[PDB]
Design a protein around this nucleic acid. Structure first.
Lengths: 93, 77, 99, 107, 72, 195, 73, 186, 121, 192
RNA sequence: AUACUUACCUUAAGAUAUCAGAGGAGAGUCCUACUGAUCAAACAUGCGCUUCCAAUAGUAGAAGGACGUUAAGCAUUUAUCAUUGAACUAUAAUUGUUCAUUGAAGUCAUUGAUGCAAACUCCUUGGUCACACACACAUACGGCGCGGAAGGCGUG
RNA sequence: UGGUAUGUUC
């Protein structure tokens, strides 16, 4: 259905992440609320245009197809989404 | 006021029959001016009385079924 | 008619009916009469070849490919003969059939 | 009627692949996804006569020492422009389309 | 499938960027599940000024991001 | 369907309004915070030692090393090393949690104390403080604390508190010293200090 | 009032013109058939590079990937 | 970096001190204003004039398609089988075995046993009305019992009641099988 | 680089390998994969992104090449703007040690299910 | 749907005289009660009449300048009156259930046993016994401590703070029912 | 932990490798602890197979780096436009030269950026293993030790 | 035929 990477992107909500866009502009800020379509909203945004300059947005909202990548913090190195043999405690009928 | 979804925005834009400036792709693309008569779910917009002007001597074009994947921006001139 | 509400497992029959009596009349005529067609691609690679198979994505198998492109510096034409080819429908600009 | 199932019958076939960037990849096929994500081994790839982005993509894959010899490359579907099959393979027996034959028998 | 969370941008001035430079500053009147953006009183900003009619609708394919120019 | 890997709780068909409300509730917060704390504690506490490589040492190194001296090994009992390592763990966590807060209490009567140090009238991150108040939908969380808020507004000017010594200040804290090395302090002061 | 599908089913058997995205390929011919993915099939088409012609083509299949619009003369 | 909106406590936030910001350098690709494929692609009319005459001269004949020929042979065999089935099905008044009385009193019992006899079938059919005639149908190529019979009774109401009593209780238990009875459907 | 990548392996078998994934730009990401999906969205542990400058490209055109390396750490890269992925370096622990670790994870998961069944009673 | 293109096709197919029974008059005027209770626990199922956006836009364009139709307004008034009568019956049933819970048999027996022992010094003893009976009544009422919502007829609480109450008022049921009460009061002010 | 209120929601389907033949069920479909063949997975197992596994008879060195130093190393290149005033080269929205009033944004970086080149130091990895400090080879090298890491082929 | 979250009393 959804998959592991979109669940990991929805996992790190409310944390300082860093995006890079397809044009080359790198954003960095606190993730407000991520979605399954990766259309992600950031706050306290610092932006670097592909020309080179640095600016600051207050509340950005980027579409998921114009994202090169996004960096989650390192404590999500150890996540239960990464566990291969985690069993399921009795799903409901 | 309220919320106006883009499909109802284009539908009211169709009912009012305002003069239309439709933009397209970048420097190869050419800005078109006309009047909307039909559209669909993939945003294939049908326009009439089309005059094309390049990016900064317009030529008439007639009636055009402009496809969706090149449409960028729609304004009321 | 909406695509999701037609039927189940009978969409292949409608796809074959669109293949026989739709825009696919030229790819069908080339694979049954073995006539050579000229496919112009999105990077000036013009292909003269015969069609072997049809796909929904216009993925086409071509046999006895004679392809030609033009390098513009000055102006030279470089060609290549390739025996078997599997062409993706992403690259295809246009398909012309000769009578 | 997807012809990716035709490429699924092409295991251990020594082919070339021209990509949309312009790189020619000579290697044997191992497997291919139904989304045409094809894996190849015993690979040498070459950017012919330019595109500096393609030269960067050619060199920055490890194993350059402009023919680059690599052991294992997975290739995404949308980067595949065309794939050239060896002429010794018979296309009349690999394109039998047994799924299409079962669909015609089910009609 | 999922409706995007543009509820906080209901009556605030936003600034769309189009493809590397076309900064359309408007007031968000509505959106869809395709990020098509309806803007009232649009304004093209160049690094000069250009007005873009009373209402406009902008295709979500060329939309990359949007700056919330007004406080929330 | 949706399954929380943290809380080990299932859900109905995947609604964004339900999944958004699941990551706000207090049980998911407790389980998630405890899981992150325990995984960080495990990756700190895991002493991944190097695999040892012992070679056949040289002859003259053996005649030099076995004749210089023989050192003494110190070692402790089980409860002693357990108590010492527990004190070292609480010292490491209290050093990881602490921070120097001298500039906040040292510029307390400054005329721009209500514009930078108040942390609510701050410009760049003050909207983040004013946004999530944790609005205390429980009545007991609002009825528990009965002390003053002492919220310093931005509009406080220099006319208020003109003389900082008449309004009773606090004497500054002394420089804290290590308790394990507290026996080497000079016991005699330079000047006579009363009270 | 109108939709692109009845306008495009009624556009069959007319000297129509199709511009591509590249501003150097315009094909003007008689439309034959069109599917729901809006692939185009033309007959006795003519190539138009930046306005000037090069020669007649004939029966041709224009892919909906590279079209920009279709016009009615 | 100092004060957060985050719902997590400060002990979690000290563990969530993020990475340092990324060291920006100059990009390598063209910007998205310049990202496009190649312009001025010439027409294909030059290949049909000069290159087609050299292409047809090197390969005047094409390769045969064995898979398309096998699919066409399978379609032709299916069409011939359908035509033979239509000729065998299209070609009750020209049958000497169906030259009995009217079908109002003539019921048909199908899926009967292959080793049954006419005496037991007559004794089973004469229980709910007087039977006038009985005829078990067999194949013309072989003398095997196909399991079908036609029983014409003296009255239509008694034959209908016998057919209802034989087809209502999950088929009549004829001695090795369950043979249901119904109308002749002539 | 004498690694001898497996001859019949796929993305489920290439997990926890130090990949060297190529993109459309050529911005090569080096790091361990830990997850994927249908769109080939790859998370990358201890990842580094390397490029070549425009001045170095003239020397690269037909030796030493000074690549520009930035450190990303744990990132999550999309499958749209990527081109190809290879296996650069083998992981730390071996196949038998990963097998023993997977058996310990299975036994720990079965013990956790027994603890949930004991707490449910 | 799993793809958004089929959702947009559905929006086009449902977006593209006028006095016909197929058009939902409560939706043609606005705020149909079968629309304001679609997916909640108080759902009525599915509206048998069809809803359309083009007819709603035509009705808005007619009511802007052209004219107004009193028949659809009277039908919406009758539907709102029937739904308000059903909700008032539900609120009266909830008030009767609250009165039955406040007047249970064992609770009234305990209250009568406390009041039978409730009878200067005698006045102070009677005041202390009345305070003890009031404390027992407060402990009996605090076992549930459920009030009655004056508008929507739900259950509330007095010791609950204003934030959980504000979370209660922002629901689909309460917003829809306050809008229906505003429409009913507007139609009763216009009719009378 | 029990009891109750409230806010949101209440589900895209079909299937689990392929081919040929025989039998059963009222041209088409299903089943066979039915039979032969291909393929996949798991567990074992062997191929004088393919690659790698760091001195100790010393104070070293192989692979990958430093987001380390010398190093502000050496050689190059840039660090805003317009109106007017006192002269002015002058096809420009006076561009060029010296000085200034004013007008819109106005990356920090010039100890900056690119290229070139050497030395030093420090990090992660290993069989730092068992015998010996030894005279072999045109069919070029007795690959005929105990293993480990990666892979190929073959068998059950 | 149910799930998630929250607030009171024992």
């Amino acid at each position: 259905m959804n998959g592991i990477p979109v669940k990991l992107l929805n996992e790190a909500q409310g944390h300082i992440v860093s995006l890079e866009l397809t044009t080359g502009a790198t954003y960095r800020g606190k993730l407000v609320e991520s979605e399954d379509s990766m259309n992600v909203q950031l706050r306290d945004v610092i932006a670097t245009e592909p020309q080179g300059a640095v600016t600051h947005m207050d509340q950005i909202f980027v579409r998921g197809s114009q994202i090169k990548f996004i960096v989650v913090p390192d404590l999500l190195k150890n996540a239960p989404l990464f566990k291969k043999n985690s069993s399921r405690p009795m799903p409901p009928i | 006021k309220a919320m106006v979804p883009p499909i109802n925005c284009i539908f009211n834009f169709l009912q009012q029959q305002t003069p239309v400036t439709i933009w397209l792709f970048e420097q190869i693309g050419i800005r078109i001016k006309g009047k909307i008569v039909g559209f669909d779910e993939f945003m294939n917009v049908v326009i009439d009385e089309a005059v094309e002007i390049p990016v900064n001597k317009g030529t008439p074009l007639g009636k055009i079924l402009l496809k969706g994947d090149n449409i960028t921006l729609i304004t009321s001139a | 008619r909406p695509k999701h509400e037609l039927s189940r497992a009978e969409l292949e029959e409608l796809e074959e009916f669109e293949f026989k009596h739709g825009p696919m009349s030229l790819i069908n005529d080339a694979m049954v009469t073995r006539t050579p067609v000229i496919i112009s691609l999105r990077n000036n690679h013009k292909i003269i070849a015969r069609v072997k198979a049809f796909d929904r994505h216009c993925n086409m198998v071509l046999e006895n490919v004679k392809e030609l492109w033009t390098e513009k510096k000055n102006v030279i034409n470089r060609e290549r003969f390739i025996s078997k080819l599997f062409l993706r429908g992403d690259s295809v600009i246009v398909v012309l059939k000769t009578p | 009627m997807k012809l990716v199932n035709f490429l699924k019958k092409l295991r251990n076939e020594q082919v070339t692949i021209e990509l949309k960037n312009g790189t020619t990849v000579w290697g044997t096929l191992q497997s291919v996804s139904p989304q045409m994500n094809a894996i190849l081994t015993d690979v040498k790839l070459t950017l012919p006569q330019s595109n500096g982005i393609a030269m960067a993509s050619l060199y920055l894959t490890g194993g350059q020492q402009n023919i680059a010899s690599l052991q294992y490359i997975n290739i995404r579907g949308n980067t595949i422009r065309q794939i050239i099959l060896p002429d010794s393979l018979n296309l009349d027996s690999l394109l039998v389309d047994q799924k299409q034959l079962n669909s015609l028998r089910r009609s | 499938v999922s409706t995007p969370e543009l509820k906080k941008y209901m009556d605030k001035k936003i600034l769309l960027n189009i493809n590397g430079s076309r900064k359309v500053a408007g007031i968000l009147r509505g959106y869809d599940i395709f990020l098509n953006v309806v803007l009232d009183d649009a304004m093209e900003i160049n690094g000069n000024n250009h007005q873009l009619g009373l209402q406009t609708v902008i295709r979500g394919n060329s939309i990359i991001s949007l700056e919330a120019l007004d406080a929330i | 369907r949706y399954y929380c890997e943290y809380c080990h709780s299932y859900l109905t068909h995947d609604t964004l309004s339900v999944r958004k409300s699941h990551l706000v509730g207090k049980n998911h917060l407790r389980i998630t915070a405890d899981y992150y704390r325990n995984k960080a504690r495990d990756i700190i506490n895991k002493h991944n030692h190097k695999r040892r490589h012992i070679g056949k040492r040289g002859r003259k190194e053996r005649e030099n090393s076995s004749q210089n001296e023989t050192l003494k090994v110190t070692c402790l009992s089980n409860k002693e090393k357990r108590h010492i390592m527990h004190v070292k763990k609480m010292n490491q966590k209290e050093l990881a949690q602490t921070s120097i807060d001298t500039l906040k209490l040292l510029y307390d009567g400054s005329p721009g104390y209500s514009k930078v140090f108040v942390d609510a009238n701050r410009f760049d991150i003050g909207d983040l403080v004013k946004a999530s108040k944790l609005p205390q939908r429980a009545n007991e969380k609002s009825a528990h604390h009965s002390f003053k808020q002492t919220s310093r507004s931005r509009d406080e000017t220099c006319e208020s508190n003109p003389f900082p010594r008449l309004n009773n200040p606090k004497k500054l804290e002394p420089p804290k010293i290590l308790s394990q090395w507290s026996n080497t302090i000079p016991k005699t002061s330079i000047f006579y200090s009363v009270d | 009032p109108v939709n692109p599908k009845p306008f495009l089913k009624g556009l069959v058997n007319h000297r129509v013109g199709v511009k591509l995205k590249f501003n150097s390929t315009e094909y003007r011919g008689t439309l034959v058939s069109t599917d729901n993915y809006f692939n185009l099939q033309l007959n006795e088409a003519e190539e138009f590079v930046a306005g000037v012609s090069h020669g007649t083509l004939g029966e041709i299949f224009i892919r909906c990937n590279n079209v920009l619009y279709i016009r009615e003369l | 970096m100092n004060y957060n909106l985050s719902k997590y406590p400060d002990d979690v936030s000290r563990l969530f001190k993020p990475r340092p910001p990324l060291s920006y350098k100059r990009p390598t690709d063209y910007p998205y204003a310049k990202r496009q494929t190649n312009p001025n692609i010439t027409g294909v009319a030059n290949l049909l004039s000069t290159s087609l005459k050299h292409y047809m001269e090197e390969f005047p004949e094409g390769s045969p398609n064995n898979h398309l020929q096998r699919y066409e042979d399978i379609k032709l065999s299916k069409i011939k089988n359908a035509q033979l089935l239509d000729r065998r099905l299209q070609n009750p008044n020209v049958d000497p075995h169906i030259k009995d009385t009217d079908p109002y009193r003539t019921i048909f019992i199908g899926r009967l046993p292959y080793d049954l006899d006419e005496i037991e079938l007559q004794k089973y059919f004469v229980k709910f009305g007087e039977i006038e005639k009985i005829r078990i149908v067999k194949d013309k190529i072989t003398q095997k019992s196909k399991g079908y019979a036609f029983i014409v009774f003296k009255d239509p109401i008694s034959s209908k009641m016998a057919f209802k009593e034989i087809g209502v209780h999950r088929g009549i238990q004829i001695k090795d099988r369950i043979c249901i009875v119904d109308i002749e459907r002539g | 680089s004498k690694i001898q990548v497996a001859h019949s392996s796929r993305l489920a078998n290439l997990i926890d390998y130090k990949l060297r994934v190529l993109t459309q730009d050529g911005r090569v990401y080096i790091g361990q994969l830990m997850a994927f999906d249908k769109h080939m969205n790859l998370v990358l542990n201890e990842c580094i992104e390397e490029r070549v400058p425009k001045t170095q490209l003239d020397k690269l055109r037909p030796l030493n090449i000074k690549v520009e390396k930035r450190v990303l750490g744990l990132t999550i890269l999309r499958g749209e703007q990527i081109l190809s992925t290879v296996v650069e370096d083998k992981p730390l622990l071996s196949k038998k040690e990963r097998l023993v670790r997977d058996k310990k994870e299975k036994k720990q998961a079965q013990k956790q299910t027994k603890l949930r069944k004991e707490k449910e009673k | 749907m799993s793809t958004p293109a089929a959702e947009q096709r559905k929006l086009v197919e449902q977006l593209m005289g006028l006095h016909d029974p197929k058009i939902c008059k409560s939706y043609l005027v606005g705020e149909c009660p079968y629309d304001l209770f679609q997916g909640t626990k108080q759902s009525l199922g599915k509206c048998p009449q069809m809803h359309l956006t083009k007819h709603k836009i035509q009705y808005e364009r007619e009511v802007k300048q052209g004219k107004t139709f009193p028949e659809f307004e009277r039908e919406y008034l009758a539907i709102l009156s029937r739904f308000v009568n059903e909700c008032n019956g539900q609120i009266s049933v909830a008030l009767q259930n609250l009165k039955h819970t406040a007047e249970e048999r064992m609770k009234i027996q305990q209250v009568t046993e406390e009041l039978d022992v409730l009878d200067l010094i005698s006045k102070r003893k009677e005041v202390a016994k009345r305070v003890r009976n009031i404390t027992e009544n407060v402990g009996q009422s605090a076992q549930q401590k459920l009030q009655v919502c004056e508008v929507c007829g739900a259950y509330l609480s007095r010791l609950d703070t204003d934030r959980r109450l504000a979370d209660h008022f922002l629901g689909k049921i309460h917003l829809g029912y306050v809008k229906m009460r505003e429409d009913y009061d507007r139609l009763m002010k216009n009719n009378r």
